[PDB]
């Protein structure tokens, strides 16, 4: 009894360039399924026209993964000359008790390493400074290095917020409501990797494994711009 996100033309293009993974890495709906009206409790259109992702459980996800219209997986040169841009208008609700971090956008490599996660966190400590209820960028320092550089981007609001990720050459930038919050961070540690965007709800380290993470997107796109 759920309305499909494909009923809104603002999502047609990105759905054509996506497949949906739930609740783990396995694809449940390819682009043709998404365009044919796929909807479920974990992926549906709200009455005020948000694409809502919802998922429970540790490291579980309801997430779109970037695809080419050819049906090829997106696998662009992580540090190449073509710009890759993801833009999203995201409303992050107040999360259910027991939800501690939800990844909402990623740049992921074609193996096991996220270049970038943008996540809501209940609390984070960076260089001795603790922030609560914020939106965070996490950039992994290398494929063989589990450490990451973390940057607070925004105080959490429930208001619809515009997030833009720009990847070009070996640099990655993040703008939030038009303001650059991460300015050309180095990602040369992914030279020789290939990459793709993701968007949705990816539930990280919950303290209640039955609680639902929930993330809403009013607009979403990912594009190339050729140099």
- Nominal resolution in Å? 1.7
Phi, psi of 7 (to 5 degrees): -70, -10
Q: How many CA atoms lie within 13 Å of 127's alpha carbon, on the beta-carbon side?
A: 5
**What CA dihedral angle connects 101, 106, 110 and 111, to 10 degrees?**
-20
The SS3 call for residue 96 is coil
Experimental method: X-ray
Residue 54 to residue 14: CA distance in whole angstroms: 19
Residue 15 to residue 18: CA distance in whole angstroms: 5
Distance of alpha carbon 190 from the chain centroid: 18
User: Helix, strand, coil % (nearest 5) of the chain?
Assistant: 10, 55, 35
Distance of alpha carbon 178 from the chain centroid: 18
Residues 6+ apart with CB under 8 A from 128: none
CA distance readout (Å), 52 to 21, 25, 129, 168, 200:
14, 18, 32, 29, 8
The SS3 call for residue 34 is helix
């Amino acid at each position: 009894f759920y309305t499909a996100p494909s009923t809104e033309s603002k999502f047609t293009e990105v759905l054509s360039k996506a497949k949906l993974q739930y609740p783990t890495s396995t694809t449940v709906a390819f682009a043709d399924d998404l365009l044919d009206g796929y909807a479920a409790s974990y992926f549906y259109l709200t009455s005020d026209l948000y694409m809502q992702f919802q998922v429970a459980g540790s490291s579980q996800r309801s997430e779109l993964r970037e695809m080419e219209t050819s049906g090829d997986e997106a696998a662009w040169d992580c540090t190449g000359s073509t710009a890759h841009v993801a833009s999203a208008q995201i409303a992050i609700p107040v999360q259910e008790d027991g939800i501690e971090e939800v990844t909402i956008l990623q740049v992921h490599d074609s193996d096991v390493t996220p270049v970038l996660r943008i996540s809501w966190v209940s609390s984070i400590t960076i260089d001795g400074v603790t922030s609560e209820d914020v939106v965070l960028a996490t950039i992994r320092n290398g494929i063989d290095d589990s450490t990451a550089t973390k940057t607070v981007l925004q105080a959490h609001t429930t208001s619809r917020t515009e997030f833009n990720i720009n990847v070009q050459n070996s640099k990655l930038s993040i703008t939030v409501d038009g303001t650059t919050e991460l300015d050309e961070a180095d990602i040369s540690q992914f030279d020789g990797s290939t990459c793709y965007f993701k968007a949705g709800a990816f539930n990280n380290n919950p303290t209640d494994t039955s609680a639902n993470a929930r993330i809403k997107m009013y607009e979403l796109e990912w594009v190339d711009h050729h140099h």
